[PDB]
Every structure is written in structure tokens, then in C-alpha cells.
Amino acid sequence: GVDFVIHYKVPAAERDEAEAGFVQLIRALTTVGLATEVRHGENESLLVFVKVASPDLFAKQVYRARLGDWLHGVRVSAPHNDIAQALQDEPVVEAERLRLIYLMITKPHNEWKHVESIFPLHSHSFNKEWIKKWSSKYTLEQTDIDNIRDKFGESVAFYFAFLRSYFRFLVIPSAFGFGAWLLLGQFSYLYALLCGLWSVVFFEYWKKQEVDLAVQWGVRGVSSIQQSRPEFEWEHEAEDPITGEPVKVYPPMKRVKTQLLQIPFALACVVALGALIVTCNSLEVFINEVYSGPGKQYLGFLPTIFLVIGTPTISGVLMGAAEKLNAMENYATVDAHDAALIQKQFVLNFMTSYMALFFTAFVYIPFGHILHPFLNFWRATAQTLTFSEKELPTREFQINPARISNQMFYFTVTAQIVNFATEVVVPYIKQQAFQAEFLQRVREECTLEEYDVSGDYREMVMQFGYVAMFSVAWPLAACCFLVNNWVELRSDALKIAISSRRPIPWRTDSIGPWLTALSFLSWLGSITSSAIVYLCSNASPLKAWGLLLSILFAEHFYLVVQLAVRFVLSKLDSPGLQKERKERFQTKKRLLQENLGQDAAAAPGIEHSEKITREALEEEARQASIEMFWQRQRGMQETIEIGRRMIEQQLAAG
Amino acid sequence: GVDFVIHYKVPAAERDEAEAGFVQLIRALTTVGLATEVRHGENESLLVFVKVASPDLFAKQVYRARLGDWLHGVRVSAPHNDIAQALQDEPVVEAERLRLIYLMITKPHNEWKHVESIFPLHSHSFNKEWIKKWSSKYTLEQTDIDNIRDKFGESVAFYFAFLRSYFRFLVIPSAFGFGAWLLLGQFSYLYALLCGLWSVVFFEYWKKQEVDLAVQWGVRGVSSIQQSRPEFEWEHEAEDPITGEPVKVYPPMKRVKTQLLQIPFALACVVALGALIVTCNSLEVFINEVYSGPGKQYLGFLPTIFLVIGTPTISGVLMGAAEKLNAMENYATVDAHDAALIQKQFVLNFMTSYMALFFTAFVYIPFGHILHPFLNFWRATAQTLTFSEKELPTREFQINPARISNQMFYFTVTAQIVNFATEVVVPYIKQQAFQAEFLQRVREECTLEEYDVSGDYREMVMQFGYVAMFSVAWPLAACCFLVNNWVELRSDALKIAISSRRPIPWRTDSIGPWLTALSFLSWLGSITSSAIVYLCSNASPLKAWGLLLSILFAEHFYLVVQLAVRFVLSKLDSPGLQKERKERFQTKKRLLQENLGQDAAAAPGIEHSEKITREALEEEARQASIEMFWQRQRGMQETIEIGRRMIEQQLAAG
Ligand SMILES: [Ca+2]
Ligand SMILES: [Ca+2]
Ligand SMILES: [Ca+2]
Ligand SMILES: [Ca+2]
């Protein structure tokens, strides 16, 4: 097991001595401001190793960070022992350390004229047992995820927390999905209902989980604490309505107006990518269904090639408009900025993941006769390419309902197998192609890319969409994903260890933008599922009332289930919210104890009512100093006897 | 201006001396336990006047109440001056006083074997200027509502706060409603969209307002503080997960199961009342449209008579099932119990308010030919009643599309005019029929019923439903309500003063159950409006795609607008939530100041990095006591020069 003695590593690119020297000078000048540097240079770029010297001055800042998080309400419990030494009963976590030191480097004490990167080194001793402990287990445990947070951070930890929770909830649709396939058959108006019921439950349950995890890990509300973006544009400067600190203000409603440009942007993505996909699909239909002679197997690959060339090209242009629009929307924090870019990308992701299926389930199978003009375009076009005047041989366009079954098999089986290769084997091959002890190891790790949680997030989010929307045409889809996800936990853990450098510890109290993505896919999947069932069941397909009622009932079934599930979960106890609400109580309680001598939160004796008589006496006397207003027959019994006397008097009248 | 010197009044019914005497004895025995009693008896029932004697012992309990509200998080700011006398810079409010002693009277220190009632006396001096100041103003102000809370309480105050906000938001549909009527015409697929847009805005805006009002009045979360119901059934006893106090527990999910019986209950109400209303409507059609000879004007009243007899009779039975089901659901607090009974009643209210219109807009006008079997039933039935064998004269059933216009005129004009009479003139007539100074006045006031906020709440809530659902067939409806609501503010204030006794000060942080009612009416009104537009426009009415597309677009327009409005409002500042989040900050800040000497929330000088060198020296020495692991070239410049030396060395290779 190889060891490490470094906290962070800073490589400074060496182009020309003039600026490279200046870079090395002041970067050193600043780093030594608070942290030790040992600078050994390898691979034509100098490597500045940085670690905290004084542990006394470090824990003084770690504790100061604990206070900051607690002050703004991010941390549930204060470190109010007030002595930093004895406060290490809650010891400094490696992620907590690595994060806080990263800040000292990356706070406004740096970022420095094209520094190559800043990254911590891995822990081979930890990564070994990591992939080992998980490859032996059939079932992961919460403490395993807690360990992930400890060494890497909540940003990485939540994904595994999400993937794990999504994995076990995926058992349910694997159950009645197998049962639907085994008994009920394809296109069942029952699996769709159970799929909608499931999607609502899993989503609402995970939202409830995120609060608990945020409280457990003490990151609840960390999103509005992180450093604001440098290139954030602000019109004026005011006071924080909470903290009172000088915050730079930019009109929220002015941002809302700018964010309205996502509506035409989204349509542009649906049109651009959609036209690209529906075109390749028409070729796929023309080449296979409509014959076109020898070389068909050679020709069959050609439309697939168009996708590979077309997708990054068209979406790359659209991404430029996204990145440009993202800056215009002007986000205060790095958290909000990257979360908005991801949402913009989701429209691109949606198209390149489902449009092939939409074309099949809503255009191809239920109608298909509208594809004839598309087919003729390829008929004439291919004739030109042939160069020979003779017509390409042709046969009647016949609709094959097995198309939706073949595509679903790809996305659920074949596409997931080539995923394991692309996500793991291809990066590992790159290492093989590349092919003191610290330095060689550090050379290696310097090369790798930073781990991106977003890539792993969408792979599962887009996968969920397949279940929510198109699994009614292939009920065995959930089972294929269930198997994949077990390996996905292992595989993603494996690539973090050896295929990428250790990511900077970063904190979030939610999966973020992916929540809306899941929620949208779940809703649209209620319309999609039922609509597919009606159209693909194959009486004449009466689009008028037949299609719309199927959608009307299933969508409203989804909406009612939504209200039902939330209602039930709202009456269940929530550990996360209970902790925060209890600390707040006791904190308020403590001040009361200190201020009032422990005695607050009995009833006076009857004899005290004589003191009551005394106060009435004192009132009368003060009024006696000075008409009907002050009348009292004082004493307990005097009133009783008068009232008693009244009782027999009133019956005397009767 | 007549004055008062009493806080509360307790009349004890006198039937037979044995129990009436026992009632008078111990009720007195208990009342004097903490409060003064003067007992003068009038109108065959003894009147026990109760007021607080010791003002020193009273403010000691008022302040203790302030602490209680603040401790549980209901109050934003503590009364932490700790001296009750100087804490009257926030003086004791009359409602605050009256509420707290009502508790003193009615907590488990009473309720006492059929005590007639317990109620405070009005303030004629205040009620005079009340109706005066509002009858002079064109526009009410927040401070006017604040005054209402002061003398009556938040329960009464919220209604007027709701009515006022609902009144001014009702200006908007009065605007484009007049415009739709003036220009666009009836059944416009544009007013409906603006109606849905408006309903979402007003509702979401009011929800935001309730938080602010709750914070302003310091009642935020008071619902889970009030005394639990005596007849609440509890299985076991545990500790409050927050307070730690012994709370009696009843399984929430066991209640959820019991609450599932509202689904068949609702259907029973829709069927029972629905059958009753659709029957009277068939008579209305038979008597007017289908002639039936002389006495038609006399006969015309007969179906209306059926409604007046039928409605309280059928719904009275259904209410018994509601009251029975309500107890089974077993609610912990009186707040939750009455809120659930109101929700059950809403189904009855919904039917008796809109079913006549549904019959017109969905059965009568767009079809009507399905009414022929209903008409024949009355044809034969009337023949039997006539006693003469000769057939009743008959004429062709002809559909009149002006029916929906006539009914809408009733509900918006005529029904609101007879409302002013029933809600104000009829109670005032009752006083005229009824026709020392303390005695005369208190005798009069004892008779009056307790003010019910629920009655005034539904009148406006059911009115809102007319706008949200059926105003597209009568766009001038909002204007008629706008005029009514201005008077409604005045009139309801007038009946509280003279038509009813002063209500006990009671606190809530929301309008409660009416929120869901408004939200449901707003949603259903999106389907109702568009469906009405399509069906009542009057090509053949293709129910299949035509009706459903109209609903599909308008409902989804509603759902998207919902997300849009919430998104916008979520980026606006909320005064209520800002106060609570700031106190929590400063409270946490204060403890930090006390504990750490005011100094927490600069950067060390470069020379300190020599102390950094010192700590590295201390590390080495301790390791020196004891291979590649501990390597350092100490000092700022030693690292710089080595790195510098590396620079020209690496270029030498090149
Ligand atoms: Ca994979
Ligand atoms: Ca992955
Ligand atoms: Ca009225
Ligand atoms: Ca009213």
C-alpha cells in the first residue's frame, strides 16, 4: 500500500520563462502566505506540493468553519464546547480538511494566470478496500455511503446514495414488470398504472430522504453559503436581510425575464436534434424495410454513422447557445450556474435518448403510412448516388411491430453493455496506451481528468425515463436496469479510483437539477405510457376520444396518486426535520433556563384566593379615594350564599 | 357610549335546585380559585360575572404565555427583558387578555355540567367607530385589520384580511370580464385562460401572504399548540420528539385508513343532493318549457319549494354521517376536528351551489334531448295529480340557451341581494321581535348567537367558485361580486357588532380548510371553463376530440401557469420568512458573542509563515527522535530557488 504525505498539488504550465517565471514567483509568494510548499518539477511542468504546516492554526480555522456553518443554520448542532481541542470528539474528516484547505488556496488568495489544475491525491489503501468491500457485498449499507462522504464529499456521496436508493426501488418494477411480461403481455393498461404509482412513490420518497441526508451530513442549505461567482454582474449593493453583511444585488425578476429565452431555446433543440434523428430513422426504414439491393449489411451501418457525426455537431452548436444563454441569466454562485447549464443540456439529452422511440411508438407503428413521402425522398436520392440510371430494387413498405421490441432491447441490454466498455474499458485502455515513487505516481494522477458527477447522474436519470415512459412496451426493462445498477455501483466506484483523479470535496444538500428532470419524466411518462398502450395495441384507432381518454384517465390517476402519496408521507415522521426542530427548541430552552433559573416551561392554592380578595380590597380602597361600576360582594362564600338564596327565591315565583 | 367593567360572563341554567345548586356551588368554588366573581341573576338564569383581580399575578401569566409561544417557535421575538413590567412596551392586547383568561376559565379548571355559555361583552364605543371608519373609507388599510385582531382575534382578523385581499384581486377579473362582455362576447376561449391565470396568481399570492400575517401577528404554527380534545382516543403514551413532554399517541396511518371513508361519503353527497337538484330542475323545465296550462305562475314556485324542503332534509342526514365519520377519524385538537368537518360539508356546499349550473351547461344546453325521458315522467305524474282524465296541454320541448344567462344573473345579482337581507335584515328583525343598564344590555347580548367565521368564509369561497368555473358564460360576474364584496366588508362588520355576541379570541395562522377548497375550485374551473366554452358555443359538437382537446390544453395551461407563478413568487422576498430566519441567526450569533468575546463570524502576516517553519521544525525533531516520507526543504525562498533552478535545467534538455 503506497502512502501519501501531501494535501494538495499545484502544477504550473511552463511556456515562456517571462510569464512562467512570474507565475512561479507570486503563486509561491501567495501560497507561503498560509501554507507550506515543496516544489519538485516533472514532465516539463513544475509541481507545487502544498500542505498545512501548523496543525494548531489549522484546527483554529476548522473550528471557525464549524461555527460558520452552524451560525447560518447549515449545521444542526453547535461545537459550543468552545475549546477546539476537545471539539475533536467530532474529529476532522478528510473531506472536511481537504475542502477547507482547498478554499484557502482557492478563496480570494488565488484564481493564477492559467494554473494547470489543483487537485488532492488519491488514497490507494482506501480505494483497494473500497472496491473490495463492495464487490463482496450483495447489499450496500448507509455507513458505506457515509465513508464515501468522509473521503470524497457529499457531492460524490449523494450520487451513490441516490443510485443505491434508486437501485432498491427498482426492484418493484422488476417484480410486476416480470409478472406483466410473464402473464399479462405487452402494452398492458395495468403495468402503466403500476409504473406511474411506482414513479410517484420513489420520487416523493427520495425527496424526503434528501432532507434527512442533508441533516445527517450537516449540509442542509449549503447551496446559499458557497462563494459567489467572480463574473457575477451586480447593479447595486445592499445588506443581507438575514446576516446584515454587504451583499451585491441583481434584480431577480430581471433574471426571470432573461430565463424566458429557454422556451425558444428548448424548441430549437427539439427541432434541430429531432430533425437529425427522424432523418436517420427514415434511412433506417428505407435501407432495411425497403430493400435497396446488395451491400444492405454494409449500407445498414451508414445511417448509424450519420448519428455519430451528427449528434455532437448539431448539439455542439446548440450547447454554445446554451453556454451563452447561461451567462446572460447571470447566476450569483457557481452552484446555481452549473445547475442551470445542466437543465439546458437535459433538453438535448432528452432528444438523443427518446426521439427514436417516439418516432416508433407514435409515428411508425400506430400509423406508418405517413412515412411514404419520407421513403420516396430516399428512393430518388439513392438513385442519384448509384450513378447507374436503373432504379434501385424496391419492395412494399410493410410495418413491423417488432421494431419497438428491438429498440427497447438495445437501450436496456446492448446499450448498457457497450456502456460498461465505454465508461470503464476505454479509459483503462487509455492508461495502457500511456504505458521518486511519489513523483511517478503523481505524474500519472496529474494526467487524469477530474471526476464529473453529472455524467453518472444523467446515465441513471435518462435510464429512469425509459422505465417511466417506454417500459410499458417492454416490461422486462426494469430487470435489465436492476442488474446493471448493481454493477453500476461497483463500476462507477472503480472508475473514480483508477480512471479519474480524486475530485475536490464539494457539498450539496440535494441531487439538484435532476429532481425536476425526474419529476418531468415521471409526469410525461404517465401520458406516454397510456398513449403508447392505446396506439400500439393494434378496431380502428379512433384518435379522437380513444387516445385522449386514455391520457385523461392515466394522467389524472398520476395527479391523484401524487396527492395521495404526499399526504401519506406528510404524516410519517421525518428524522432530519425532527433534529433541526428539536435543537431550535432546546437552544431556546437553554436561554430560558439561564435567564430564569431553570424554572419555566404550579397552580395556586385556594387560600391564595384570599390574596385575590386582598387585591380586590386594594382596588376598592383606591376607588374609595375618589358609580355602579365598582360593585363586588367579596369572598368565596358570600357570593355562593347570595346565589344560593337566589335559587329558592326564583322557584318561589314559579 | 356605554362602558363595561367585566371581562367574562358565565350564565348557569336553572332547571331543578338539586343540580342547579350543585352547579352554582362548585362552579363558584372553582372560579374563585383564581378569579373574582360577582353573581347577579336575570331572566331565570344566574349570571356569573368574572374578571381578573390581581393585575400583578395576571401580567405574570401573560408574560409566561409570551415565553410559551416563543419557546415553541410561534412567536418571532422573545420578551427576554425578563422583567414583566418593562415588557409592556409591547402592551397587553385586549384579545390577548380575553383569550388568556378564557383559558383560565375554560382550561382544565372548568368544562361544568351544562353551563349555558361563556362569552366576553362587546365594546359599543369601539363598534361605533368601527362601522363608521369603514363606511367612510373607500379602501381599507392593514392597520384596520390589525385593530380587528386586537379587539377580536386572528380567527376573525384573517377573514377580513382574506376578504379584503380577495376584494382587490377581484378587480382584475372585473376588468377583462367587462372587456370580454363589451367586445369578445359570451363563451370566449380567452377569458377562460385569463380566468385560470388570475385564479393561480391570487391563490398563490394569498398563501404567501398568510405566512407574513402569521409572522406579523406572531401566530405562526399556533395550530399545534392549542389544547387537545377531551374525547380524543389514544392507544399509548410517549415523549414529544421535540419538547420531550408526555404526549398521548394515536397511530397517524390508522387515521389515514379511517379517512378513506370520505371517498364513498363524498359520492353519497353528490348522488343524494344531485338527484334532488336534478329532479327539481326537471320540474322547472317541465313547468316552464312544457307549458302545463293555467296556474303556471302558481305552479312555477312549486319546484323551488321542493328545494327549500329538500336541501336541509337530505343534507341534514348526510351531515349526521359526516359528524359520525368525523369522530371516527379521531382528531387530537379542536382545530383539526372542526377543520375536517368543514371539508366534509364542502361537498354538500359544492352540490347545492353549482349542480344547477352543471345541469345547464353540460346536460341542458349542449344536448337537452336526453331530458325527454325526464320530461315524460312529469307528464304522466302531473296527469295523476290533476284528477281529470284529460291530458295536460303540452308543447314542444325547445332548448333556450338564455337559461345559463338567467341563472348566472341570479347567483351574481339576485342571490346576493337576498343575501344582504338574510344575513343582516333578518337577524335585525329578530331583535325587533324581541323588543340596571348593565343588566338590560347584558340580557340583550346573552340572547345572540356566537359569531361563526366559517359561514362568512364559505360565502366568499363558494362565490369564488362561480368566477373560477362558470364566469366564462357570464363575464360580468366578477363586477357584481366586486360591488358585493365592498359592501360585504361593511355588512359583515356590522353583523358582528349588533347581530351577534363578541366571539372568544381564537388564533390561527391560515384560513385553514378553505385553502384546499379554493385550490380545488381553481383547478376544476380550468376544466369547467373550457368545456363550457366548447359545448355552449353552438358544426356538430364532436365530443370525442373537440371537447377533450379543449380540456387538455386549458388544464395543462393551468398546470404550467401554476409552475410559472410559483417560480416567480419563489424568487420574490418574503417578509415573514425573513424575520424568522434573521432572529434565528442573531440568536445563534448572540451566544457566540457571549461565549467567544464578540470576536467571530484576520489573515496572518507573511512573517507568521516563519512560525509555520517552526512547526515544521518541531515535526522533524519529533521524527528525528525515531524514510522518504518526511522530506522538506524548509523556508519560502529555498523552495523558490530550487524550483527556479529546475526551470533552466528543464530547458537545457530541450
Ligand atoms: Ca454503465
Ligand atoms: Ca455511471
Ligand atoms: Ca352577504
Ligand atoms: Ca359574509
Which of A53, A70, A256 lies nearest to residue B616, judging by beta carbons? A53
Whether B33 sits inside 8 A of A5 (CB atoms) is no
CB pairs under 8 A between A and B: 245
Closest partner CB to A585 (pick from B80, B243, B587):
B243
Closest C-alpha to B589, from A247, A594, A80? A80
**Whats the size of chain B, residue-wise?**
654
Return the ligand number nearest the Cα of A495: 2
Classify each residue of B393-430 as buried b or exposed e, where b means 16 or more C-beta atoms within 10 Å of its C-beta: eeeeeeeebebbeebbeebbbebbeebeeebbeeeeee
Do A57 and B28 lie within an 8 Å CB cutoff? no
Q: Are the Cβ atoms of B552 and A549 closer than 8 angstroms?
A: no
Residue owning grid cell 454494409: A298
Per the CB < 8 A criterion, the answer to whether A328 and A258 are in contact is yes
Query: Which helix (H) or strand (E) element contains residue A50?
Result: strand A45-51
Closest residue by Cα to residue B214 from B577, B646, B599, B467: B577
Instruction: For residue B272, give how far its alpha carbon lies from the nearest alpha carbon of chain A (Å).
Output: 24
Those residues whose C-beta lies under 8 Å from the C-beta of residue A374, and which sit 6 or more positions away, are A282, A285, A286
Picking from A5, A243, A600, the nearest residue to B585 by CB comes out as A243
Neighbouring residues of B85: CB distance < 8 A, sequence distance ≥ 6: B59
CB A156 within 8 A of CB A451: yes
The neighbouring-strand residues paired with A237 are A248
Which residue(s) pair with A42 in the sheet?
A: A45
Measured between CB atoms, which of B17, B21, B34 is closest to A604? B34
Q: Is residue A251 part of a domain?
A: yes
What is the residue whose three cell numbers read 336541501? B311
Q: Are strands B45-51 and B8-12 parallel, antiparallel or unpaired?
A: antiparallel
Within-domain flag for B547: yes
The residue numbers preceding gaps of C to N over 2.5 A in chain A are 111, 435, 538, 601, 626
CA of B149 to the centre of ligand 3 (A): 22
Cβ distance of B640 and A28 shorter than 8 Å: yes
Asked whether the beta carbons of residue A578 and residue B548 sit closer than 8 angstroms, the reply is no
* Dihedral sign from CA coordinates of B624, B625, B628, B632: negative
Percent helix / strand / coil, chain B, rounded to 5: 70, 5, 25
Element (H, E) at A125: helix A124-136
Residue B380 CA to residue B396 CA, distance in Å, equals: 16
Method: X-ray
Resolution of this structure in Å: 3.3
Residues of chain B contacting residue A633, judged by C-beta atoms under 8 Å apart: 38-39
Residues in B closer than 8 angstroms to A565, CB to CB, are none
Beta bridge partners of B38: B49
Q: At which residue does the C-alpha cell 417484480 appear?
A: A175
Is A651 among the domain residues? Answer: no
- Residue A151, min C-alpha distance to chain B (Å): 21
Distance CA A320, CA B479 (A): 51
Kindly determine whether residue A32 and residue B606, on different chains, have CB atoms separated by under 8 Å.
Answer: yes
CA dihedral A315, A318, A324, A327 (to 10 degrees): -70
Which chain A residue's Cα is nearest to B244? Answer: A582
Cβ A464 vs Cβ A524: under 8 Å = no
Choose the mutation target among A633, A636, A639 for the interface with B, i.e. most B CBs under 10 Å: A639
Q: From the centroid of its chain, how far is CA B103?
A: 23
Contacts of A54 in chain B (CB under 8 A): 611-612, 615
Q: What element of type H or E holds B160?
A: helix B154-169
Residue B651 maps to a domain:
no
b/e for B327-355, b at 16 or more Cβ within 10 A? Answer: eebbbbbebbbebbbbbbbbbbbbbbbbb
Residue B71 to chain A, least CA–CA distance (Å): 6
**Which residues place a Cβ less than 5 A from the ion ligand 2?**
A 456, 459, 492
What residue in B sits closest to A633 (Cα-Cα)?
B38
Among all bound ligands, the one having the nearest atom to the CA of B492 is: 4
| C-alpha cell of residue A409 | 432491447
Residue B307 located in a structural domain: yes
Out of B585, B612, B633, the one facing A38 most closely (by C-beta) is B633
Residue in B56, B224, B548, B607 to test binding to A, most A beta-carbons within 10 Å = B548
Compute the distance between CA of residue B410 and CA of residue B404 in angstroms, rounded to an integer.
10
At B10, give phi and psi (nearest 5°). -125, 105
**Which residues, 6+ apart, have CB-to-CB distance to B606 below 8 Å?**
A32, A33, B636
Ligand number nearest CA of B163 is 4
In DSSP terms, which residues pair with B236 in a beta bridge?
B249
Question: Does B32 sit within 8 Å of A636, measured CB to CB?
Answer: yes
Gap from B305 CA to chain A (nearest CA, Å): 39
Rounded distance, CA B64 to CA B159, Å?
29
CB contact at 8 A, A299 and A392: no
In angstroms, the Cα distances linking A140 to A33, A205, A278, B129, B436 are: 44, 19, 42, 71, 82
- Please name every residue paired with B450 in a beta bridge, in sequence order, or none if there are none: B501
- In the numeric block, which cell numbers belong to residue A23? 507565475
- Mark yes or no for CB contact B5/A629 under 8 Å: yes
Question: Which cell is B196 given?
Answer: 385560470
Residue B414 lies in a domain: yes
As a whole number of angstroms, the distance between CA A638 and CA A640 comes to 5
Residue A279 belongs to what domain range? 1-601
Buried b (16+ CB within 10 A) or exposed e, B153-174: bbbbbbbbbbbbbbbebbebbb
Which residues neighbour A551 within 8 Å (Cβ) at sequence distance 6 or greater?
Answer: A527, A530, A531, B552
Site from A38, A58, A439, A633 to mutate, B interface, most B CB atoms within 10 angstroms? A38
Distance from C-alpha of B643 to C-alpha of B223, rounded to nearest angstrom = 69
Q: Which residues of chain B does A568 touch, with a Cβ-Cβ cutoff of 8 Å?
A: 253, 256
Residues of A in contact with B542 (CB under 8 A): 544
| Shortest alpha-carbon distance between residue B390 and chain A (Å) | 47
Cα radius of gyration rounded to whole Å, chain B: 34
Distances B290 to A248, B356, B382, B396 between C-alpha atoms, Å:
74, 19, 12, 7
Q: Domains in chain B: how many in total?
A: 1
Grid look-up 358585493 returns B484
- Interchain proximity B643–A46, CB inside 8 Å: yes
B42 is in an annotated binding site: no
Give how far B421 is from chain A: nearest CA, Å. Answer: 38
Do the Cβ atoms of A66 and A75 come closer than 8 Å?
A: yes
Q: Taking the CB of residue A191, how many other CB atoms lie within 10 A of it? A: 26
**B445 labelled binding-site residue:** no
Residue A116: burial class (beta carbons within 10 Å; 0-12, 13-18, 19+): middle
Instruction: Assess contact for A73 and A97: CB atoms under 8 A.
Output: no
Element (H, E) at A40: strand A36-42
Three cell numbers at A375?
Answer: 421513403
Exposed/middle/buried for residue B635 (C-beta within 10 Å: 0-12, 13-18, 19+): middle
CA B410 to chain CA mean position, Å: 26
C-alpha cell at A418: 457497450
3-state class (DSSP) for residue B3: coil
Give the CA count within 13 Å in the CB-facing half-sphere of A284: 19
Which residue in B has a C-alpha nearest to residue A600's C-alpha?
B64
C-alpha distance from A426 to closest chain B C-alpha (Å)? 33
Report how far ligand 1's centroid is from the alpha carbon of A409 (Å): 16
Q: Do A640 and B24 touch (CB under 8 A)?
A: yes
Reference A269, options A325, A326, A328, A322; nearest CA is: A322
CB A314 within 8 A of CB A272: yes
Gap between the Cα atoms of B528 and B470, Å rounded: 7
- CB contact under 8 Å between B644 and A24, yes or no, is yes
A72 contacts in B (CB within 8 Å)?
585
- Please check whether residue B134 lies inside any domain of the structure: yes
Concatenate the DSSP letters of all residues of B223-252 into one string.
GGTSPBPTT---SEEEE-TTT--EEEE--H
How far does residue A448's CA lie from ligand 2's centre (Å)? Answer: 17
Q: What is each CA distance from A52 to A59, A127, B417, B522, in whole angstroms?
A: 10, 24, 81, 61
Burial call A612-633: b when 16+ CB within 10 Å, e when fewer: bbebbeebeeeeeeeeeeeebe
| Total Cβ atoms within 10 A of residue A503 | 18
Q: Which amino acid is at A272?
A: A
| CA of B608 vs chain A CAs: smallest distance (Å) | 8
Strand partners, B9: B49, B119
Which run of H or E residues covers position B49? strand B45-51
Q: According to the annotation, is A423 in a ligand binding site?
A: yes
- The alpha helices in B514-606, defined as continuous H runs, are 514-537, 548-569, 575-596
CA atoms B31, B35, B36, B41: torsion sign:
negative
- DSSP assignment string, A328-345: HT--SBHHHHHHHHHHHH
Q: Please report residues of A whose CB lies closer than 8 A to that of B651.
A: 17
Distance CA(A475)–CA(A192), nearest Å, equals: 9
A634 sits in the region (left: phi over 0; alpha: psi -120 to 50; else beta) called beta
- Can you give the three-state secondary structure of B396-434, one letter per residue? CCCCCCCHHHHHHHHHHHHHHHHHHHHHHHHHHHHHHHH
Closest residue to B609, CB basis, from A33, A82, A596: A33
Q: Provide the residue type at A54 as one letter.
A: S
| Nearest to A91, CA basis, from A63, A57, A122, A56 | A63
Number of Cα atoms under 13 Å in the Cβ half of residue B302: 15
Of A78, A595, A643, the CB nearest to B82: A595
Asked if the structure places residue B124 within a domain, the reply is yes
* Angle at which helices B477-498 and B453-470 cross, to 10°: 180
What spacing in Å lies between the alpha carbon of A452 and ligand 1's midpoint?
A: 14
The string of DSSP codes covering B418-474 is HHHIIIIIHHHHHHHHH--HHHHHHHHHHHSPBP-HHHHHHHHHHHHHHHHHHGGG-
Q: Which phi and psi (to 5°) does residue A251 adopt?
A: -50, 115
Query: In this structure, are residues B450 and B102 in contact, taking their beta carbons and an 8 Å threshold?
Result: no
The separation between CA A516 and the C-alpha centre of its own chain, rounded to angstroms, equals: 9
Residue B488 counted as an annotated binding residue: yes
Q: Give the C-alpha separation, A477 to A583, whole Å.
A: 45
Whether B99 contacts B505, CB under 8 Å:
yes
